[PDB]
């Protein structure tokens with residue numbers, strides 16, 4: 001929880017890039033390569049980094065990536081999770097992993113989302129690509145770039161689409177209930193071991209009979225209105241598929257809470 005002097009941050013590698021980049025650095029004030037490793041995020045967006053840091057300063061959970069401080073143009077310094085993105089990890093260790101492990105990860109993501117809910121924080125971005133793996137036994141939620149704190153008196157706000165709840169698609173509405181819908185897509189992703197051919201984009205594009213890279217918002221809404229949903233992945237226990245279907249109830253108030261999904265996933269693992 002400190003200001004990291006830029007001169008002491010020794011660049012190791014680029015971890016990711018998007019809309020924005022995350023760099024693996026060694027914080028070496030001594031200058032003898034004994035210092036701890038950190039992940040440094042760097043970028044009209046002064047308002048957005050101000051928004052993101054205010055949220056991250058306030059989160060303290062073993063299931064949410066730890067905010068470590070700042071460095072300087074504002075840079076955000078976070079803990080580094082050595083096993084990287086869940087999407088990469090599941091694809092590389094598929095043969096060595098099992099349904100038990102995916103239930104353990106599902107339970108941990110659900111605990112972090114319960115915590116975010118307790119802070120009236122909407123994550124919005126939740127997807128396997130922003131879940132990070134600390135160790136074989138532990139994952140954490142990352143990417144707070146689109147996160148938002150709800151007002152005290154309003155449980156929603158108005159702002160890829162394959163993780164979004166229908167109200168987000170049709171009315172630009174986001175809430176903790178739309179985060180539950182996205183969590184259902186994450187459960188789907190975990191159970192495919194993040195396989196590219198069965199990704200939410202690949203599967204929804206097949207279901208919609210699309211012959212293009214970019215989906216049509218109107219067609220996805222039509223498919224969802226019909227009651228169509230992502231199928232149960234081959235590796236998927238029937239119990240988990242039922243939980244996904246609940247997260248995907250068309251009305252937000254009819255979706256389960258993370259506090260209700262959580263013990264169920266925990267038990268399936270245990």
Ligand SMILES: */C=C\C(=O)Nc1ccc2ncn(-c3cncc(Nc4ccccc4)n3)c2c1
Nearest residue numbers: 015016039078079080081084085129130142143
């Ligand atoms: C798959 C990319 C990757 O390996 N990324 C990554 C690995 C390890 C790690 N530790 C900490 N972070 C981190 C820290 N703060 C923010 C972010 N932001 C994002 C993570 C994942 C997707 C998008 C943004 N990551 C990483 C990141």
